[PDB]
Design a protein around this nucleic acid. Sequence first.
RNA 1: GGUUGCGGCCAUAUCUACCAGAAAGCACCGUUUCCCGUCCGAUCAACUGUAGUUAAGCUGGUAAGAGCCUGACCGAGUAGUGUAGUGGGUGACCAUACGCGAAACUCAGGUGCUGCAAUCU
RNA 2: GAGAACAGAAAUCUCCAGUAGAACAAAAGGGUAAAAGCCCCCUUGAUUUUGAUUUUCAGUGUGAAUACAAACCAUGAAAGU
RNA 3: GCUCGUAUCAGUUUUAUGAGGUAAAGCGAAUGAUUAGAGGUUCCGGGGUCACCUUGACCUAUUCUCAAACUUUAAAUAUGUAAGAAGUCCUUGUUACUUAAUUGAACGUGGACAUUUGAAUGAAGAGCUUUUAGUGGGCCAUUUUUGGUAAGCAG
Lengths: 292, 169, 58, 222, 159
Amino acid sequence: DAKSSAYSSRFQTPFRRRREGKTDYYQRKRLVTQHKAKYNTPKYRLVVRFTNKDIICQIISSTITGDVVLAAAYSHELPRYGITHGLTNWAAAYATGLLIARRTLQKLGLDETYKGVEEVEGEYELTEAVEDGPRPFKVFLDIGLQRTTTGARVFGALKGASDGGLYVPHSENRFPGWDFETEEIDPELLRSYIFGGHVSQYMEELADDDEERFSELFKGYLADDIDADSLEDIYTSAHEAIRADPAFKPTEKKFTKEQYAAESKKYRQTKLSKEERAARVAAKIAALAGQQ
Amino acid sequence: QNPMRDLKIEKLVLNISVGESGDRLTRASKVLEQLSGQTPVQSKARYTVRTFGIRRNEKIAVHVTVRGPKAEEILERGLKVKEYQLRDRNFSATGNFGFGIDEHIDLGIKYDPSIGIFGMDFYVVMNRPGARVTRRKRCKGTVGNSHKTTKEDTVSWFKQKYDADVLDK
Amino acid sequence: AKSKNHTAHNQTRKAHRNGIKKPKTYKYPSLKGVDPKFRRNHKHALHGTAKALAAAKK
Amino acid sequence: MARRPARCYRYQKNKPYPKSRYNRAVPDSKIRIYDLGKKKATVDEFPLCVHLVSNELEQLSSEALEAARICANKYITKTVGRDAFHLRVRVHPFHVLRINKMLSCAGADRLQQGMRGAWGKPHGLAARVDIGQIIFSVRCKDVNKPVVIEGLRRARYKFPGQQKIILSKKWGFTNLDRPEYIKKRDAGEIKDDGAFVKFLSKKGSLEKNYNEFPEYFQNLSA
Amino acid sequence: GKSHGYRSRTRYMFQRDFRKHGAVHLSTYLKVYKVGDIVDIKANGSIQKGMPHKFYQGKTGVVYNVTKSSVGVIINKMVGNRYLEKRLNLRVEHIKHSKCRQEFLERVKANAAKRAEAKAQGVAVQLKRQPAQPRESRIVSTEGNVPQTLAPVPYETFI
RNA sequence: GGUUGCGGCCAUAUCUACCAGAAAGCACCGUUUCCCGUCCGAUCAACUGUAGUUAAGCUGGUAAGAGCCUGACCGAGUAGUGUAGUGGGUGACCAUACGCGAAACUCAGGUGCUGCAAUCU
RNA sequence: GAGAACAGAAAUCUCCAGUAGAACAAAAGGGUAAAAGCCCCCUUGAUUUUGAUUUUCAGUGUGAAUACAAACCAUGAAAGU
RNA sequence: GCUCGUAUCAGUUUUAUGAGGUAAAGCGAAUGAUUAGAGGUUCCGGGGUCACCUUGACCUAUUCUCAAACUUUAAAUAUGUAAGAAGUCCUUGUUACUUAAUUGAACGUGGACAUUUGAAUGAAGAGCUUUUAGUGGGCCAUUUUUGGUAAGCAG
């Protein structure tokens, strides 16, 4: 308390996005920097952010005035491809990484090659270059603030991109089920995580055990009357659907932007001018002097 | 008025200070284990004092933090000997509070040999829901002035819960 | 015994008597201290264009 | 070891050499009291302010300030009383003077090396003084003007250089001219602060201003 | 023991100016440097690898080499009676573009644009810059601006 | 126009107090089987947008607000300084001629703008 | 600053403020706040080859340093270092 | 002497663009010092009424004076670069470099570039090399300035 004026004068505020805490500049400082002998070539970042109820994944290359986005892929549009509930789960995180990997490859014109893996058996296999062809698109995973951790959804999307024909360097260290006694990953355990095995196994356990929590949680799955075994089916159907049309169909955008501005402005607080400020103090000075 | 603005216990820290290192610490550790059901951590000495028998880095205290319904249970059994009544003092400017007891081994569970008798220190950290906003890594901010906790808000919460009363002195 | 240890007197007059002339910069500067990766890539690029121009003039 | 004549150190030949973490063995200043007379005295009572002003650039020894401080105070208090004036010394002796002690005995050349290692040891304090600055400021009532003149003209003899006594148009120790000050004091703009006055600012929190200067706002509504 | 270290007499040169300490803004890295681009050295003391010498503060030189995380600059040095060509390997944190060139560049384009127009219509468009020529004649009206009479102010003490 | 994600300039953006927040978003919020990490699922990790909330965050507004930024024929052409004199002054320094020229003070205004993409009565 | 048995100015824990008023082996200065500080984890790049360059400078040496190349490694999820 | 003949130049100015941290200025800006007060304390001492007269500091708003080893700011002079045919613009060729790429970089091939070929003034010839002499005790003056009390003192 009692913030001194000298402190206010001398306080060097950090960068705006550091003040908000959203951007770790020390780490961005070495991501977006580029080999100076590669003068104009952008260095693309595969940025994934796990907000509540949605997954944000996008491809970002830095310019002088600000970051430009090639193409983005969120989890709000996943219902179009068949993923309805639990758009934040680990399996969805893999799917949204697959979706953006397909999206960017088709936007660049490299869809016909680098199919990644059509059959996902969950083994650590990078997307190598083909013999005498354009190189695989190289993007760098900028997870941001959230901690690196084995089995984190952030590396679920990592596996999604690297299985989507997009070459993002990584090690099998942070994928779920990474053993410490031996450096073998479990393809069966990943394949479960790809299709929600860590979720369907909790489906069936609760369903076998009780119904209170099983009906409280997972309510939308109960609404569609879809069982855990169908979770694998719907995730697959999403994958080939994603591999069928990643062309980024937008929404219908009813009540378009000028109307959007129109309604916001009515409920939007305005700012006074000097005349209001002069009037307000005069009324306040008179009130405080009005026999007080 | 507002449902979720109601206060709740965040954590109790169960503090003990031991002059030396040895079997007393070991039994101090295990009495806290049977106290809270979770192993405590040996807070390590910070400086040398030459008068309290302390060299640097000699692990001169034991404490543990308890949260959740187990915290609700453990403060109840800890405040029963306190008699659900407390001094008008002991309340911090943020509304956190604490006090000390003299024994726990046979206070709530059967006493067993080779454990000694230890007094110790309670301290309750109580804040209303939303505390993550000042502890999360991303989008770290503060808690607004209304959301803060004060003496009158905490002591009032002390009244309605347990029907307790303050200022027994 | 004790002597004047240091001075810059008459140095600037000496320096400008013959003048300080710029190093007479040259087209096609000394290709030294450059990145080696650039350098003997630049070798092959100059090789390739020489053959092309040689074949262009036949 | 005796003090040197002041004309040794009169001129501002050297850069400021104050007492610091690099200058630790500095002797204490001889002058220690800078406000004299009824110093707990308000502002309205002493409208007249007169200054002892330097017209030359030199160093005034800390002791010479103390001598003139004594003589000026002693004369004025004997004439118009202790509580009729407020004498304030403006300048403070921060510059540390250095002396190179030479042995004055026969055979001194043997025990001393001339200026090999001529860095003088701290000798005393003085105030570096410039043109047009103020050395002494005396605020008093218009009545006892000639006494303070004689008091301030009896202190110049103890100062090196050629000083001047000039009465100031500013009200006492304020920066405001007499009519401009009275305008504010008439319009409740001014609050006594023991030895000085705080002026109401047209900038800042209106609440704090109203609390600190209620009389101004009351006069506005009348 | 007189000292001539690599960072002597540099208490203020490598300071971080007030309210701009800490990390460096990222437009420093995103700036693109090609060989031959004139650049001026400003040492940002926050980054310690690849700092320039104190003699190179504010000097300007062309770029002859571009490396992984640094550029190579050619500077002229006042030594003896002749200039020597010095090659520095400086991190991009200590370097920025010289805005003198872009002014020459933009003027050339306007100069080229005028030449294209003077090719079609209005030849001899007076290509070369002309410095501030002496003021030409004018008429200064008195209407509503009668010359007021001024006199020097009498001296008073102000104190 | 609001919101989100990534940013650029890095306080006109900060800080202290109070106020408002339609829709959407955000956030708090709920549960530990799994991965994971702690004395403690508080942080982190996972599962659910379901049980609720605008209280807080956040956004914006308010303050003769501190601060910060800009400008002023405001201080001030002042301090200072380059050049000149067989200028003055014993000296200290000062004046003048031809140039450049502040800082503090005073007052006025302002309190983020914007890039890419997406979303939203 | 507010507090908390023993425990006091100072032994340990919690909260609030805290533009750095601490620490960074050692002089002083510069520099650093999701770090260059503290704690933890993993490692040896404190490795090899030579060259180029900066400082002292005769543009000699020595020392120190900078940026690369070819490797080979370390670390990280990676960018990168 | 040599290679050339008005320049790839200049102890200079202007334009523009920087760099500094001295002078000055500043302490109701940090740091270190500083004179005077004014208003406000936990039971981290009232020493006497145990809360009742007597004080035990600190914080706030001021105030005076400073700083070679303090500084927000901040000159003057001095100082760096640029002011074009070795440039600009357009096109497409090489690379074992680079990019996701037929992406860029570097080097280019061809093609358009007089009233002024791209600020001012001047150029007295410009540039380059070889060789060798003497010298390598300095001193004075305005300004700046260190040690000294000062010096026809020392630096």
